């Protein structure tokens, strides 16, 4: 005869499932000498989960019944057990089937306690990252049901089911990440089943935010006015530029250089340190040639898709008194630097020489005072700016002196003052 | 007296500019013997540009007058020089100012003929790149006025003016660039002034498009279904994955790996080649333990801000006949494998043995044929699936023989078939 029974797993050893006397009365009481029958179980002596009492026919749990090690994740679980009546003469055969129900004696569990995941700050709102699945060997209501993520402002989870039915958690970036502000997170993922009592397991996700090159260098200020004495030595520090980049590694490492469009002249006279940004002089400047310079400097990081920053540096040169006045004396005489005077006297206010002075410099450094200091009484008459005339101031005397020596002094209004002197003689 | 004249540069040497005798008549005609006066130029510097005719006072070009070498880029240009009348008796002084005008005898020119510029395809519509400025030593309308860029579909040009008045060209990205399609451009930039005849100069732009990581790997298919014999040797090639990335260098170098969320079990049994994508078996499979696998494999490039690609590989394991049938024979005898039989003549169909068979496999590989072989007159009667009884089939006349030896055959319906044999003796 066939008998079917229904138990819960892990019940205490020795508990009775059924009593043959009570359930197979129709068979036992119809044998010869009903009270003399004895029972024998048909199993091996290794791990007998069900046992029969040979004297009264009690079917009781012999060893622990773990549904999980027995049927794994199958919904249907049942143990088979054959019992026979002794003696052999007209023995009966009882095939006993015990359906095993599952209790919730297993909590959700994670493979690893630390779940390291790396996310680039570039990751767009909506990015999804499947997380480790917890394992719950139970079945039905007792198996893994849902997940939950510790409260925070940047991540969520959606619970999903894959092809085979199992459930898993998908991490979702819901707010724009920024490594420059918060580089790492630590959040708790909790899996829980739907059993009674409800069980839970948990793991910690260590989210690390990798840097992307979402920031370019920045200058303190964009414009600069530098004054430079035209006599500064090669190597003078014109300006130490400082730019900053919040990014990490190469993305935040800055290189300074002259903008790609700078004129060659600027590169001829100035040099910029690629690493520290020391704008230095390479060959001296001359106010008498170019009075100003408009340098365009750029700073760019060594990261990908890099946008550069730029600042403008105006170098204004200032004049120094590095040019001495020039004296030119011109005469009517076609040949030489000598002024010919009539042997026998001459009239007053007679043209002797034209005098022109000039100074390369500017301002007071280029303004000239001219003085005539010959050994006599000639007069230096102004005609226009920096152009004077040399004339006489009284009637001369041939007999007294024949050779004259005149000296012109040109002295600019600079400090230190500079001056030159020229000499020429008057033959009469 | 002051005299002002207006001439053009580069005029034919020897041409007459003005006649002093004619222009200072109002002064000469008030002298004694106006017709005897002669003129002398006060030519200063090592620059003999203009000459005076001593007899009539004609001002003629002594040497070529190049406005560019004299006043450079200044609007106001003039040569100043003093001329005097002979004889000295009340000689006159004429200050002459000769304004030199500019002709368009110089074309715009570029410092370098090839202008190499590098642009990353990531550069957004609107990016601007100031380009080298050409230099035109002319002045006014004759100097650099406008620029022009060879016709194209990806770049535009805007003309600009800097603080000091000079003009420059700003390159503009007008349409989204894509290096994967077109890696370089070559465009002609022409600077032209506004003189008549209009003169022009040109340089060529070598535009290089640097690659950015704007593409992630791609798989041929999204999922793959693999059937796998549970007896395949370690190393069987399950699948050769091919992913492609159009990017350059590291951006296009692909790495294959198991997704970070795969279970340790999957990594215990499978291996993926990081470089070529060879999904191979690491530890043999057993259909009797796990029947399928859902592998999540990813391929990502070695570039920045990299998004990985994903493919799902479903491995269906298939049963083979790799388990032999198992026989359990149970008897009355508690000690050893001999079944003690009633010495006295027994009736037909008397219990001798209980026999159970089983097979781990599935389908025909798990279907068992059970057969009873022996000396004679025994019957193997089925009770239920894979469970039979050994009984007697004739009157046990002890006289014939006392010892019997019986052999039980379990042979599954697999291919190749597997079998188990049991032996036990029947004493009467
Ligand atoms: C992934 O890419 C794999 C590579 O295939 C190429 O990839 C790139 C580089 C391009 O060239 C592209 O055009 C190619 O597709 C690809 O695997 C290939 O698959 C084919 C069949 O699908 C294979 O052809 C078969 O080759 C074997 C062996 O020959 C090879 O191996 C020997 C030993 O190493 C070498 O000496 C040879 O030079 C070959 O390289 C043959 O035995 C076989 O012949 C039999 O099968 C064909 C039909 O396939 C019949 O017509 C014949 O009559 C025979 O019955 C084929 O010739 C090819 O070998 C293989 N190459 C690999 C793996 O490198 C794969 O399909 C792509 N996708 C996936 C999902 O795997
Ligand atoms: C760029 O930065 C440098 C360095 O400044 C220092 O380092 C940076 C990384 C930042 O952390 C700064 O906050 C930090 O101060 C600047 O150079 C520094 O300039 C100052 C003056 O501005 C120097 O100190 C002065 O030196 C004079 C002359 O001897 C004294 O009379 C003053 O009493 C005062 O001490 C300082 O020495 C100098 N640093 C070094 C290392 O030489 C630099 O100015 C700056 N660039 C710009 C454009 O501001
Ligand atoms: C899993 O169990 C179902 C449920 O039915 C069974 O009912 C009892 C008879 C007993 O067997 C209990 O353990 C189960 O709860 C099975 O469904 C039956 O399957 C048989 C044949 O397989 C079929 O003839 C019946 O009609 C089915 N019953 C119903 C209500 O539809 C199912 O077969 C079991 N699956 C496996 C793989 O064993
Ligand atoms: C030029 O001639 C005039 C004629 O009157 C003189 O006055 C200048 O000399 C100065 O003036 C007189 C009044 C006297 O005080 C004399 O001592 C002055 O030096 C004369 N100048 C020169 C430089 O010879
Ligand atoms: C230069 O010439 C202009 C005419 O274009 C005139 O207006 C100006 O006065 C001149 N520059 C001077 C006088 O400094
Ligand atoms: C057992 O003996 C009977 C007697 O006729 C016979 O019919 C039967 O075939 C025998 N058993 C087997 C398995 O042949
Ligand atoms: Ca259990
Ligand atoms: Ca359980
Ligand atoms: Ca559970
Ligand atoms: Ca950021
Ligand atoms: Ca940066
Ligand atoms: Ca960053
Ligand atoms: Ca100088
Ligand atoms: Ca100077
Ligand atoms: Ca001076
Ligand atoms: Ca010229
Ligand atoms: Ca010119
Ligand atoms: Ca020109
Ligand atoms: Ca592209
Ligand atoms: Ca690209
Ligand atoms: Ca790529
Ligand atoms: Ca197997
Ligand atoms: Ca098998
Ligand atoms: Ca088998
Ligand atoms: Na610096
Ligand atoms: Na491959």
Residue linked to tokens 């642009």: B119
Q: Which helix (H) or strand (E) holds A73?
A: none
The approach used to solve this structure was: X-ray
CA–CA dist B31, A298 (Å, integer): 70
Backbone angles phi, psi at B324, to 5 degrees: -80, 150
Backbone angles phi, psi at A420, to 5 degrees: -130, 155
Tell me, which fold does domain A1-105 have in CATH?
A: Immunoglobulin-like (2.60.40)
Q: Kindly report the nearest CA distance between residue B399 and chain A, in angstroms.
A: 22
Residue nearest to atom 16 of ligand 2 (CA): A240
β-strand partners of A353:
A390
| Residues of chain B by 3-state class (helix, strand, coil), percent to 5 | 10, 45, 45
Nearby residues of B271 by Cβ (< 8 Å), 6 or more positions away: B279, B280, B281, B282
Task: Please say whether the beta carbons of B357 and B368 come within 8 A.
Answer: yes
The CATH code of the domain at A106-212 is: 2.60.40.60
Task: Please say whether the beta carbons of B191 and B108 come within 8 A.
Answer: yes
CA–CA dist B84, B57 (Å, integer): 10
Task: Please say whether the beta carbons of B138 and B104 come within 8 A.
Answer: yes
Q: Is the CB of B242 under 6 A from ligand 1?
A: yes
Chain A residue at shortest CA distance from B303: A304
Annotated domain spans of chain B: 1-105, 106-212, 213-321, 322-428
DSSP string covering A187-221? EEEEEEE--SS--EEEEEEEEEEE-------EES-
Task: Please say whether the beta carbons of A282 and A327 come within 8 A.
Answer: no
Backbone angles phi, psi at B56, to 5 degrees: -120, -5
Within 10 angstroms of residue A51's Cβ, the number of other Cβ atoms is: 18
Task: Please say whether the beta carbons of B136 and B167 come within 8 A.
Answer: no
In this complex, the residue of A89, A117, A261 whose CB is nearest that of residue B131 is: A261
Task: Please say whether the beta carbons of B17 and B108 come within 8 A.
Answer: no
CA–CA dist B198, A67 (Å, integer): 98
For B27, the 3-state DSSP assignment is: helix
Backbone angles phi, psi at A196, to 5 degrees: -120, 110
CA–CA dist B261, B27 (Å, integer): 108
CA–CA dist B4, A241 (Å, integer): 51
Most informative mutation of B75, B97, B100, B141 for ligand 5 (most atoms within 8 A of CB): B75
> So what's the architecture of B322-428 in CATH?
Sandwich (2.60)
In this complex, the residue of A111, A133, A264 whose CB is nearest that of residue B111 is: A264
Ligand 16 centre distance from Cα of residue B70 (Å): 9
Nearby residues of B316 by Cβ (< 8 Å), 6 or more positions away: B225, B226, B227, B228, B291, B292
Within 10 angstroms of residue B404's Cβ, the number of other Cβ atoms is: 21
- Nearest Cα neighbor of A374 from A419, A422, A411 is A422
Q: Is the CB of B244 under 6 A from ligand 1?
A: no
Task: Please say whether the beta carbons of B381 and B367 come within 8 A.
Answer: no
Chain A residue at shortest CA distance from B73: A290
Q: Which helix (H) or strand (E) holds B67?
A: helix B67-71
Q: Kindly report the nearest CA distance between residue A27 and chain B, in angstroms.
A: 18
Task: Please say whether the beta carbons of B420 and B360 come within 8 A.
Answer: no
Across the interface, do A296 and B350 touch by the CB < 8 Å criterion?
no
Q: Which helix (H) or strand (E) holds A359?
A: none
Q: Is the CB of A240 under 6 A from ligand 2?
A: yes
- Nearest Cα neighbor of B386 from B354, B351, B346, B419 is B354
Looking at ligand 2, which atom is closest to the CA of residue A224? 48
Q: Kindly list the residues from chain A whose CB atom is less than 8 angstroms away from the CB atom of residue B207.
A: none
In this complex, the residue of B122, B314, B356 whose CB is nearest that of residue A305 is: B122
For B363, the 3-state DSSP assignment is: helix
Nearby residues of A92 by Cβ (< 8 Å), 6 or more positions away: A1, A24, A27, A28, A31, A84, A85
Tokens of B53: 């005719």
Q: Which helix (H) or strand (E) holds A260?
A: none
Q: Kindly list the residues from chain B whose CB atom is less than 8 angstroms away from the CB atom of residue A222.
A: none
Q: Is the CB of A242 under 6 A from ligand 2?
A: yes
Q: Which helix (H) or strand (E) holds B77?
A: none
Task: Please say whether the beta carbons of A324 and A420 come within 8 A.
Answer: yes
Domains B1-105 and B213-321 agree in fold: yes
CA–CA dist A242, A225 (Å, integer): 16
A366 half-sphere exposure, CB direction, 13 A CA radius: 11
Task: Please say whether the beta carbons of A58 and A19 come within 8 A.
Answer: yes
For B149, the 3-state DSSP assignment is: strand
> So what's the architecture of A213-321 in CATH?
Sandwich (2.60)
B21 half-sphere exposure, CB direction, 13 A CA radius: 14
Backbone angles phi, psi at A363, to 5 degrees: 60, -150
| Residues of chain A by 3-state class (helix, strand, coil), percent to 5 | 10, 45, 50
Most informative mutation of B352, B378, B379, B406 for ligand 6 (most atoms within 8 A of CB): B379
Task: Please say whether the beta carbons of B118 and B48 come within 8 A.
Answer: no
Nearest 5 degrees, angle CA B239-CA B244-CA B245?
150
Strands B223-229 and B309-318, sheet pairing? parallel
Looking at ligand 4, which atom is closest to the CA of residue A377? 24
For B321, the 3-state DSSP assignment is: coil
Residue nearest to atom 1 of ligand 6 (CA): B393
């Amino acid at each position: 005869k066939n008998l079917k029974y229904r138990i819960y797993e892990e019940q205490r050893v020795g508990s009775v499932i059924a009593r043959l006397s009570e359930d197979v009365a129709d068979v036992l009481l119809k044998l010869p000498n009903p009270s003399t029958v004895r029972f024998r179980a048909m199993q091996r002596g290794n791990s007998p989960l069900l046992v029969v009492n040979e004297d009264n026919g009690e079917i009781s749990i012999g060893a622990t019944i773990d549904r999980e090690q027995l049927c794994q994740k199958n919904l249907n679980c049942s143990i088979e057990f054959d019992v026979i009546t002794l003696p052999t003469e007209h023995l009966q055969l009882f095939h006993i089937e015990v359906e095993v129900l599952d209790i919730n004696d297993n909590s959700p569990q994670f493979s690893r306690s630390l779940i390291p995941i790396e996310i680039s700050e570039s990751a767009a709102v909506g990015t999804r990252i499947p997380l480790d699945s917890a394992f719950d060997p139970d079945v039905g209501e007792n198996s893994l049901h849902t997940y939950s993520l510790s409260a925070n402002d940047f991540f969520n989870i959606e619970v999903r089911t894959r092809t085979d039915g199992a459930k898993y958690a998908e991490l979702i970036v819901v707010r724009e990440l920024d490594r420059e502000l918060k580089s790492s997170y630590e959040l708790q993922l909790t899996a829980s089943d739907m059993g009674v009592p409800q069980r839970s397991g948990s793991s910690i996700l260590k989210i690390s935010i990798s840097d992307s090159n979402d920031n370019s260098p920045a200058f303190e200020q964009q414009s600069y006015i530098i004054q430079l004495l035209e006599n500064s030595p090669v190597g003078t520090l014109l300006l130490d530029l400082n730019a900053t980049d919040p990014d990490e590694g190469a993305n935040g490492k800055i290189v300074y250089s002259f903008s790609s469009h700078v004129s060659p002249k600027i590169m001829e006279t100035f040099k910029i340190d690629s690493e520290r940004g020391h704008l230095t002089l390479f060959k001296q400047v001359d106010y008498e040639i170019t009075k100003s310079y408009e340098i365009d400097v750029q700073a760019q990081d060594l990261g990908p898709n890099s946008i550069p920053a730029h600042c403008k540096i105006i170098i204004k040169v200032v004049d120094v008194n590095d040019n001495k006045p020039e004296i030119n004396i011109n005469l009517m005489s076609p040949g030489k630097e000598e002024i010919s005077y009539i042997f026998e006297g001459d009239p007053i206010d007679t043209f002797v020489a034209l005098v022109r002075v000039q100074d390369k410099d500017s301002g007071l450094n280029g303004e000239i005072v001219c003085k005539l200091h010959g050994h006599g009484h000639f007069k230096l008459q102004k005609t226009y700016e920096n152009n004077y005339l040399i004339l006489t101031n009284a009637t001369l005397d041939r007999e007294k002196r024949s050779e004259y020596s005149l000296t012109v002094i040109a002295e600019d209004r600079g400090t230190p003052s500079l001056s030159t002197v020229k000499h020429f003689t008057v033959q009469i």
